[PDB]
UniProtKB/Swiss-Prot annotation:
It comes from Bos taurus (Bovine). Keywords: Disulfide bond, Pharmaceutical, Protease inhibitor, Secreted, Serine protease inhibitor, Signal. GO terms for biological process: negative regulation of platelet aggregation; negative regulation of serine-type endopeptidase activity; negative regulation of thrombin-activated receptor signaling pathway; trypsinogen activation. It comes from the Eukaryota. The keyword Chaperone does not apply. The record marks K15, A16 as: Reactive bond for trypsin. GO terms for cellular component: extracellular space; serine protease inhibitor complex. Residues 5-55 form the BPTI/Kunitz inhibitor domain. Its main location: secreted. This is Pancreatic trypsin inhibitor. It is found in: Secreted.
């Protein structure tokens, strides 16, 4: 599993409130979170399905 997939979501320093997805490795499912619009970390997807394709595990 890519290393970033286990990290908590990162809103970042931005003031925007965009709804993104992170892989919740303890649930084994994608979670929404609020993203501030700049300086994303890698556990940050535009869809549940992208989060699971990248982070869901072989």
């Amino acid at each position: 599993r890519p290393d970033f997939c286990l990290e908590p979501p990162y809103t970042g320093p931005g003031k925007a409130r965009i709804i993104r997805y992170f892989y919740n490795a303890k649930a084994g499912l994608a979670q929404t979170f609020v993203y501030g619009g700049i300086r994303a970390k890698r556990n940050n997807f535009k869809s549940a399905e992208d989060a699971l394709r990248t982070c869901g595990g072989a």
